Each structure stands twice: as C-alpha cells, then as structure tokens.
Amino acid sequence: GLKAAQKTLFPLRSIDDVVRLFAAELGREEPDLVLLSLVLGFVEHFLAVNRVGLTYFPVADLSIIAALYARFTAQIRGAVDLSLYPREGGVSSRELVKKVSDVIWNSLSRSYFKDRAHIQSLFSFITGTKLDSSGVAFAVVGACQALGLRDVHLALSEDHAWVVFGPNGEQTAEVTWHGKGNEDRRGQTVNAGVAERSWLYLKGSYMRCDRKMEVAFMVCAINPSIDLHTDSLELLQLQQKLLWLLYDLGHLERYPMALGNLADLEELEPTPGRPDPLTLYHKGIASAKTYYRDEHIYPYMYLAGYHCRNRNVREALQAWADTATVIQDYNYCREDEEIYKEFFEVANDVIPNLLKEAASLLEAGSQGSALQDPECFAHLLRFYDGICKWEEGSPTPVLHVGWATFLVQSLGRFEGQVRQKVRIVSVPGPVLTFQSEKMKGMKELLVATKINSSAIKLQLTAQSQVQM
Ligand SMILES: NS(=O)(=O)c1ccc(OCCCN2CCC([C@](O)(c3ccccn3)C3CCCC3)CC2)cc1
Structure with missing residues (x-):
C-alpha cells in the first residue's frame, strides 16, 4: 500500500x-x-x-x-x-x-x-x-x-x-x-x-x-x-541477524549459498549459541544435495575457503576434489567463464601457495603434514580428474600448458614414497578411481619416483608433438 x-x-x-x-x-x-x-x-x-x-x-x-x-x-x-x-x-x-x-x-x-x-x-x-x-x-x-x-x-x-x-x-x-x-x-x-x-x-x-x-x-x-580495505560493522551485523532470522524461520532450507554467507559471517564474528561455521557450510552442502541433486559448486568452495583460511590443507583439498566431482558432469560452455576462473585460481594460485607453505613447514619438522599424507595426494588427483572429465565432450577446451606447469610443481611437493601409496583402480588405505581419460593415461607417471615433467604436460594438454 x-x-x-x-x-x-x-x-x-x-x-x-x-x-x-x-x-x-x-x-x-x-x-x-x-x-x-x-x-x-x-x-x-x-x-x-x-x-x-x-x-x-x-x-x-x-x-x-x-x-x-x-x-x-x-x-x-x-x-x-x-x-x-x-x-x-x-x-x-x-x-x-x-x-x-x-x-x-x-x-x-x-x-x-x-x-x-x-x-x-x-x-x-x-x-x-x-x-x-x-x-x-x-x-x-x-x-x-x-x-x-x-x-x-x-x-x-x-x-x-x-x-x-x-x-x-x-x-x-x-x-x-x-x-x-x-x-x-x-x-x-x-x-x-x-x-x-x-x-x-x-x-x-x-x-x-x-x-x-x-x-x-x-x-x-x-x-x-x-x-577495498574496510567493511561496515553495522551492515555485517544486520546481514548476519537477518540471515539468522531467515534461518530460524526455515527460509534458508533450499538456499545453499545463503548458508555459506552465514558461515562466513559466523567465522568473522560468532554468535553465542549458534552452530559453528563448519556445521553451516555442511548444511549448505546438504541443502544442494537434497534439493538440487548435488549439482552446485559453490557450497564446496565456501567450505574449501574456510579450510584454506584456517590451513586445514587436507580438508581444503578434499572440498576442492568434491568441487571437481560436481563439475565433471557438466559441459564447459561459452558463458561459464566465472567457474573456469574459480578453478583456474584454485589450481594455479591457491593450491600452489598452500603446498609451498606446507613444504617449508615440513622442512621445519611438521608432523601429520598434508605432504606426507597419501589421502591429500589422492584429493589433489581427484581434483584434476574432475577438471579433465569436465573438459571431455565440452565445446571449448579447459586445460592448457599454463595448467600443466602448476600440475607438475604441485605433484613434486609430495615425495615418491607418499605418492606411491595411492591406489588407483579402474572402472571396473587411500583409493581412487579416475573417470577422466587424461588422468587414466597419466597414472604411471604420477607415482614414478622421478616426476616426468614433459610427459605429464603432454598428457594433460594432449599436445601431439614436441620441439622439432
Ligand atoms: N577459492 S575458494 O576458497 O575455493 C572460494 C571461491 C569462491 C567462493 O565464492 C563464494 C561467493 C559465491 N558467490 C555469492 C554471491 C553470488 C551472487 O553474486 C549473488 C549476488 C547477490 C546476492 C546473492 N548472490 C549471484 C547469485 C546468482 C546471481 C548472483 C555468486 C556466488 C568461495 C570460496
């Protein structure tokens, strides 16, 4: 009125x-x-x-x-x-x-x-x-x-x-x-x-x-x-309260990203008496699984980002592999570039910086290190398998030599004795099945003591020939 x-x-x-x-x-x-x-x-x-x-x-x-x-x-x-x-x-x-x-x-x-x-x-x-x-x-x-x-x-x-x-x-x-x-x-x-x-x-x-x-x-x-540097505390608090109000009324039930936004706000400033961020990110994921057939990417990325900011390397890599597991059943089309950019940044900036830090912290004597955990290696491989699978049958390519460089660097962060513990099995702790043809053809290269960088590049980009 x-x-x-x-x-x-x-x-x-x-x-x-x-x-x-x-x-x-x-x-x-x-x-x-x-x-x-x-x-x-x-x-x-x-x-x-x-x-x-x-x-x-x-x-x-x-x-x-x-x-x-x-x-x-x-x-x-x-x-x-x-x-x-x-x-x-x-x-x-x-x-x-x-x-x-x-x-x-x-x-x-x-x-x-x-x-x-x-x-x-x-x-x-x-x-x-x-x-x-x-x-x-x-x-x-x-x-x-x-x-x-x-x-x-x-x-x-x-x-x-x-x-x-x-x-x-x-x-x-x-x-x-x-x-x-x-x-x-x-x-x-x-x-x-x-x-x-x-x-x-x-x-x-x-x-x-x-x-x-x-x-x-x-x-x-x-x-x-x-x-760029500053947020309104009053608007952060208002947004947070409004989201809790929507939550309690049952109105975030079918809204996965709203649950991720709330989780982010809780990490920044937790409300006494409410679920922790992790519970929240997992409800966002359960909402996507229940109402949207587990076809959404961001619920897993929100969770991944939380684990990344807190340096739970293992959990961050798992979440990203779960991300890739969603994307693998899509075709990469014109107009999907925002999700290409998100994956590109994970593979080629965020993961390499996480693993570089983990290498120093290993040099410094860290135990339970992502880089000594074969499940972390399996997650990294699952991540790339999903991207490779995504690319199959798509009208536009995804991978190119720029990705191959970071792939080689990321594999090299894990010693051979850690990489060789991953069990890669075919269709038809650590155990892993590859859905993509690129990663299946790569399986022996990945667990070799000495990483063959030029061969990995060829396999990831399907580059037919090398230098005349
Ligand atoms: N690198 S990472 O740690 O894996 C990570 C990457 C991206 C992440 O993105 C979280 C932000 C996702 N974002 C929320 C705003 C949303 C949107 O921009 C939006 C805008 C306004 C209100 C609600 N949503 C869309 C919704 C569909 C149309 C606009 C787009 C998705 C999180 C983590």
Whole structure:
C-alpha cells in the first residue's frame, strides 16, 4: 500500500528495528519486497556509501521510505497497463513479464560501471537509476509483485538470474544481461542453456524462489564493503541477524549459498549459541544435495575457503576434489567463464601457495603434514580428474600448458614414497578411481619416483608433438 500495519514499526532507529521489520513482513502471506529492498538500500547507502553525519544508525523515517516506495510504484503502475495483458488462472503471460522487464531496463542510466558495489537495491534503482545484473532480475520480481502478479518469481543459478512464472510456475524468461559481451536472449526461455548442460543453467537444478527466498536473496545481496580495505560493522551485523532470522524461520532450507554467507559471517564474528561455521557450510552442502541433486559448486568452495583460511590443507583439498566431482558432469560452455576462473585460481594460485607453505613447514619438522599424507595426494588427483572429465565432450577446451606447469610443481611437493601409496583402480588405505581419460593415461607417471615433467604436460594438454 503501504498498509497501515506495515507502517507501525517506523522510524527504524537501529539494526534490531530493521530486523523487527523483516520479521513482521515475513509473518505475512506475502512479504513486501519493494518495502524491504528500499529499506536495505537506504541503510546500506548511509552506512557504506555516505557515512557523513552518522552517529549510530541512519534513522529510516516513514516519510522518506514511503516517498521512495510511492516513486517506485507510480513508475511501474504508470508504465505497465495490465489491462493490455489479460491473465487466465491468476497467472502472467510472457508478454506481460517482458514489458515489466523492458520498463525496468529503460529506466536505467545509459552508461555506468555495471559492477559497482551498492547498486543492487531498489534504493539504487530509484535514487541512482542503476542496477547490477541480478539486481535487474530482482527489480523485475519486485515490480511484478507490486502489480499483483504473484506467479512471478526469481530464479537463480550460481552466476545468473532470471524469472519463472505462468501455469505451475513452469515458464522461464530472461530479463537481464549476463557477463561482459554476452549478446541477448532477453524474453526467451532458459531451455537451450539447460539442454546444453552448461554450469550457468545448472542442468536445470537452479533455484526457483518463493517470496521468502527472494527476501533471503536481498539479504545475501547486502554489501557491507565501504572500500577495498574496510567493511561496515553495522551492515555485517544486520546481514548476519537477518540471515539468522531467515534461518530460524526455515527460509534458508533450499538456499545453499545463503548458508555459506552465514558461515562466513559466523567465522568473522560468532554468535553465542549458534552452530559453528563448519556445521553451516555442511548444511549448505546438504541443502544442494537434497534439493538440487548435488549439482552446485559453490557450497564446496565456501567450505574449501574456510579450510584454506584456517590451513586445514587436507580438508581444503578434499572440498576442492568434491568441487571437481560436481563439475565433471557438466559441459564447459561459452558463458561459464566465472567457474573456469574459480578453478583456474584454485589450481594455479591457491593450491600452489598452500603446498609451498606446507613444504617449508615440513622442512621445519611438521608432523601429520598434508605432504606426507597419501589421502591429500589422492584429493589433489581427484581434483584434476574432475577438471579433465569436465573438459571431455565440452565445446571449448579447459586445460592448457599454463595448467600443466602448476600440475607438475604441485605433484613434486609430495615425495615418491607418499605418492606411491595411492591406489588407483579402474572402472571396473587411500583409493581412487579416475573417470577422466587424461588422468587414466597419466597414472604411471604420477607415482614414478622421478616426476616426468614433459610427459605429464603432454598428457594433460594432449599436445601431439614436441620441439622439432
Ligand atoms: N577459492 S575458494 O576458497 O575455493 C572460494 C571461491 C569462491 C567462493 O565464492 C563464494 C561467493 C559465491 N558467490 C555469492 C554471491 C553470488 C551472487 O553474486 C549473488 C549476488 C547477490 C546476492 C546473492 N548472490 C549471484 C547469485 C546468482 C546471481 C548472483 C555468486 C556466488 C568461495 C570460496
């Protein structure tokens, strides 16, 4: 409306006043996404974008929030005539959804840095005419709810956003851009992407949000960064509390990455009486396994990063091998580059630095060292096997000589007597089966006393010939 009952909690004078607002909206049949996004972008603006004047918490007076709310709703209602788009079943049509998308798109500034911080909210849309990629999709959803279109919902994969709608919520529509350069399928289904088994569309195991999960998304979208070096403590705490509130209400059940975000926040600043980060990261993984057929990559990476920051080398390598075990059943397609970059950085920067440190600490007399544990070697091998398998049948290559260099260095960190304890068995403590043809052909090289660097390179990149 706003409705009288949504107004009684104003002004919001503190973090807990914001949380109380979220609680009361989440009590409702339909939490108000426009109200809540405006409030978050407001508080984010005055705690991270401009802190001038801040003495505690930027007071969100009803007069300010209501006028922002009225601007959004007038802008949408004025520009979308619902009577031109008749609704059977209480469900929306593709043309209606496209028009709402076009409205949001056309309101945006022509040129701006599309990956700035703080352009995710309806606050940024209204005050700055700017939105990031997935912010456009959220905004389309908000606009749809404000028009009474309750079939329209946010869909998310690990790197993109679109909408679902229509009979049984079975239709999909592209409403925003993806990445740098991707030309458009705006208005189309995602079924081509699903059918080609790219990571971008998660072989169809992407998130189909209900309203509560859309609130969870805007809370994950809170960006506490003030600059490269500094975070807003007030926004970190707000985000954390909001996530716990969503957790207790059961609204993070089908949101794996939200559980990873919470775990990260708990590591930074733990809440007395709550599960530890590890429990959290494992619920994020169990959520992916239960609702998304274990087809998601980030739950394992979040866990891996935690183990990496704490120097549990063994556990970090296990998590990354689990990561690769997911990716192996995808095809590497155009538009999957963000997950290529994540794997590239693991293999070729993070793991080599972890293992270099472990080599020094071994020289310094460390026991139980990753580099003396054959299970750690097996995890490293499983990691690469999954990447190799991922590459098979993909329309674009993954591996090249730049990866081979780090592979050779990483294998060399483990002595022969440690590498030879891994048992590699065929289809048809440490025991390991390779699914990839590259790693199967490599198996003897990997356990040789002397690592044959040139042969490993040839096997990893399938380079036919050596120097004339
Ligand atoms: N090197 S590592 O330790 O293995 C590691 C690497 C990446 C990691 O990434 C964790 C961050 C994952 N991130 C969260 C924001 C998320 C997203 O950027 C986002 C943005 C806004 C709100 C919710 N999610 C997406 C969701 C789909 C569309 C945008 C994309 C995935 C963690 C660890």
